[PDB]
Enzyme design. Sequence first.
Site, PDB file in Angstrom:
ATOM      1  N   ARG A  29       0.848  -1.169   0.000  1.00 22.83           N
ATOM      2  CA  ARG A  29       0.000   0.000   0.000  1.00 22.83           C
ATOM      3  C   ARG A  29       0.889   1.226   0.000  1.00 22.83           C
ATOM      4  O   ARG A  29       1.814   1.354   0.846  1.00 22.83           O
ATOM      5  CB  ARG A  29      -0.876  -0.061   1.273  1.00 22.83           C
ATOM      6  CG  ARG A  29      -1.764   1.156   1.524  1.00 22.83           C
ATOM      7  CD  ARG A  29      -2.710   1.436   0.376  1.00 22.83           C
ATOM      8  NE  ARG A  29      -3.792   2.333   0.777  1.00 22.83           N
ATOM      9  CZ  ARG A  29      -3.736   3.651   0.776  1.00 22.83           C
ATOM     10  NH1 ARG A  29      -2.625   4.298   0.353  1.00 22.83           N
ATOM     11  NH2 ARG A  29      -4.812   4.364   1.121  1.00 22.83           N
ATOM     12  N   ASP A  34      -4.467   8.698  -0.644  1.00 21.69           N
ATOM     13  CA  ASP A  34      -5.804   8.119  -0.765  1.00 21.69           C
ATOM     14  C   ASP A  34      -6.114   8.126  -2.251  1.00 21.69           C
ATOM     15  O   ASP A  34      -6.077   9.175  -2.916  1.00 21.69           O
ATOM     16  CB  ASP A  34      -6.824   8.941   0.042  1.00 21.69           C
ATOM     17  CG  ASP A  34      -8.214   8.312   0.064  1.00 21.69           C
ATOM     18  OD1 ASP A  34      -8.330   7.085  -0.012  1.00 21.69           O
ATOM     19  OD2 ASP A  34      -9.177   9.071   0.255  1.00 21.69           O
ATOM     20  N   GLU A  37     -11.285   4.615  -5.540  1.00 22.88           N
ATOM     21  CA  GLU A  37     -11.584   3.235  -5.808  1.00 22.88           C
ATOM     22  C   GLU A  37     -12.052   3.078  -7.229  1.00 22.88           C
ATOM     23  O   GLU A  37     -12.396   4.075  -7.917  1.00 22.88           O
ATOM     24  CB  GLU A  37     -12.659   2.773  -4.818  1.00 22.88           C
ATOM     25  CG  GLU A  37     -12.045   2.693  -3.447  1.00 22.88           C
ATOM     26  CD  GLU A  37     -13.019   2.219  -2.430  1.00 22.88           C
ATOM     27  OE1 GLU A  37     -13.869   1.389  -2.811  1.00 22.88           O
ATOM     28  OE2 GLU A  37     -12.959   2.699  -1.275  1.00 22.88           O
ATOM     29  N   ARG A  75      -0.282  -5.540   4.731  1.00 25.90           N
ATOM     30  CA  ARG A  75       0.259  -4.911   3.517  1.00 25.90           C
ATOM     31  C   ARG A  75       1.539  -4.137   3.872  1.00 25.90           C
ATOM     32  O   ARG A  75       1.632  -3.508   4.918  1.00 25.90           O
ATOM     33  CB  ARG A  75      -0.738  -3.900   2.963  1.00 25.90           C
ATOM     34  CG  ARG A  75      -2.080  -4.553   2.551  1.00 25.90           C
ATOM     35  CD  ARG A  75      -3.011  -3.556   1.926  1.00 25.90           C
ATOM     36  NE  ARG A  75      -3.402  -2.513   2.875  1.00 25.90           N
ATOM     37  CZ  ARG A  75      -4.275  -1.543   2.601  1.00 25.90           C
ATOM     38  NH1 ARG A  75      -4.849  -1.474   1.416  1.00 25.90           N
ATOM     39  NH2 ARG A  75      -4.444  -0.604   3.485  1.00 25.90           N
TER      40      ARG A  75
HETATM   41  C1  LIG Z   1      -1.845   4.278   3.869  1.00 25.37           C
HETATM   42  C2  LIG Z   1      -2.120   3.585   5.196  1.00 25.37           C
HETATM   43  C3  LIG Z   1      -3.297   2.906   5.389  1.00 25.37           C
HETATM   44  N1  LIG Z   1      -3.582   2.250   6.597  1.00 25.37           N
HETATM   45  C4  LIG Z   1      -4.871   1.657   6.875  1.00 25.37           C
HETATM   46  C5  LIG Z   1      -5.822   2.726   7.315  1.00 25.37           C
HETATM   47  C6  LIG Z   1      -7.226   2.341   6.765  1.00 25.37           C
HETATM   48  O1  LIG Z   1      -7.862   1.412   7.692  1.00 25.37           O
HETATM   49  P1  LIG Z   1      -9.395   0.955   7.422  1.00 25.37           P
HETATM   50  O2  LIG Z   1      -9.324  -0.238   6.432  1.00 25.37           O
HETATM   51  O3  LIG Z   1      -9.843   0.506   8.746  1.00 25.37           O
HETATM   52  O4  LIG Z   1     -10.105   2.086   6.825  1.00 25.37           O
HETATM   53  C7  LIG Z   1      -6.809   1.559   5.516  1.00 25.37           C
HETATM   54  C8  LIG Z   1      -7.030   2.360   4.235  1.00 25.37           C
HETATM   55  O5  LIG Z   1      -6.502   1.616   3.114  1.00 25.37           O
HETATM   56  P2  LIG Z   1      -7.230   1.712   1.735  1.00 25.37           P
HETATM   57  O6  LIG Z   1      -7.349   3.196   1.382  1.00 25.37           O
HETATM   58  O7  LIG Z   1      -6.288   0.943   0.892  1.00 25.37           O
HETATM   59  O8  LIG Z   1      -8.597   1.044   1.884  1.00 25.37           O
HETATM   60  O9  LIG Z   1      -5.414   1.210   5.675  1.00 25.37           O
HETATM   61  C9  LIG Z   1      -2.631   2.240   7.587  1.00 25.37           C
HETATM   62  O10 LIG Z   1      -2.879   1.685   8.691  1.00 25.37           O
HETATM   63  N2  LIG Z   1      -1.432   2.873   7.381  1.00 25.37           N
HETATM   64  C10 LIG Z   1      -1.152   3.537   6.235  1.00 25.37           C
HETATM   65  O11 LIG Z   1      -0.086   4.165   6.163  1.00 25.37           O
END
Ligand SMILES: Cc1cn([C@H]2C[C@H](OP(=O)(O)O)[C@@H](COP(=O)(O)O)O2)c(=O)[nH]c1=O
Length: 129
Positions: A29, A34, A37, A75
């Site tokens: 990731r 952000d 989607e 991830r």
């Molecule tokens: C980019 C990033 C996302 N995340 C988590 C936060 C969000 O949790 P939630 O799934 O509970 O919303 C999710 C968002 O990813 P996506 O934007 O890929 O769905 O990934 C982290 O924990 N650390 C990060 O640096």
Amino acid sequence: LHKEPATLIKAIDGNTEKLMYKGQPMVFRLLLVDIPEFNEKYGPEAAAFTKKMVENAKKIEVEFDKGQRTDKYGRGLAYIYADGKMVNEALVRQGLAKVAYVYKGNNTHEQLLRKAEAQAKKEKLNIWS
Ligand SMILES: Cc1cn([C@H]2C[C@H](OP(=O)(O)O)[C@@H](COP(=O)(O)O)O2)c(=O)[nH]c1=O
């Protein structure tokens, strides 16, 4: 920070795209963004841009920040480079992602990405059009 090697694992067998890092398949990731989607405006354009950047690269690298290296889903959390070009920055610079998810501790390139957002917004590109 340090860039480390990885290779692209293309989507096949109903699996998703991954990177092979230290010889193991991982979902990554992108830090600090952000991304729309697929079903949202600019979702197909953001996916297509990322896919082109990584598929056409001779050399993919991952650069962890100083904090957490994986999220709660397992991830990898990184800055990803394609032939030296940062994918996180390039997406934001094209208006195909917003700066977001800035956690204390993994924010080294926050200011670089915010400047790219401001330039995308001034040029009214994509999500800022
Ligand atoms: C980019 C990033 C996302 N995340 C988590 C936060 C969000 O949790 P939630 O799934 O509970 O919303 C999710 C968002 O990813 P996506 O934007 O890929 O769905 O990934 C982290 O924990 N650390 C990060 O640096």
